[PDB]
Ligand binder design. Structure first.
Ligand SMILES: Cc1cc2nc3c(=O)[nH]c(=O)nc-3n(C[C@H](O)[C@H](O)[C@H](O)COP(=O)(O)O)c2cc1C
Ligand code: NA
Length: 162
């Protein structure tokens, strides 16, 4: 279970919703936290999904976009379980999550996705990640827009056999 693991909760958050979820997961599980920080922070304008020319619109229609991240984990291999959280952007993971997954060799490493959203599910995000990084030990993830309890998290660990 959660006590049986060295855990890192890594997350990307622009408006703080996913950050608050990450902090709660960490509090419950006793995990360490890592903020995936962009080298160039996203502004309000950048995040305007109604503007086809906004940074986020342009990045998200480019399958090869890789926003740069500020900083590096020194000993990521010391963590046995990595949770990776993000807002849903255009039905998938933001491409900074691709930058993150490609910054380390996560082959053979247990990764559990989580997300927040304005209504869309995490399933489409997961299927795309599963195909993009087949050598990661992906465990079933969760959309976490609701109430996160210690029972929800302990069941989750049970369901994914951690
Ligand atoms: C560029 C952009 C695209 C988004 N795309 C979706 C989407 O496809 N489906 C959805 O339900 N919400 C979408 N959202 C809403 C975010 O997923 C949601 O507001 C999230 O909780 C924000 O998390 P954050 O505060 O940690 O940045 C989008 C938000 C942005 C800024
Ligand atoms: Na896999």
């Amino acid at each position: 279970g959660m006590n049986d693991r060295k855990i890192l909760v890594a997350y990307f958050s622009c408006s703080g919703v996913t950050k608050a979820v990450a902090e709660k997961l960490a509090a419950i599980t006793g995990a360490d936290l890592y903020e995936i920080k962009p080298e160039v922070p996203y502004t309000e304008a950048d995040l305007d999904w109604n503007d086809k020319k906004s940074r986020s619109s342009v990045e998200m229609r480019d399958a090869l976009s890789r926003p740069a991240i500020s900083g590096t984990l020194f000993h990521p291999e010391k963590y046995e379980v990595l949770f990776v959280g993000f807002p849903v952007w255009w039905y998938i993971a933001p491409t900074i999550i691709n930058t993150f997954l490609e910054s380390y060799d996560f082959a053979g490493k247990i990764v559990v996705p989580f997300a927040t959203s304005g209504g869309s599910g995490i399933g489409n995000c997961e299927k795309n990640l599963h195909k993009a990084y087949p050598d990661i030990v992906w465990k079933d993830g969760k959309l976490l827009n609701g109430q996160i309890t210690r029972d929800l998290v302990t069941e989750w660990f049970e369901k994914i056999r951690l």
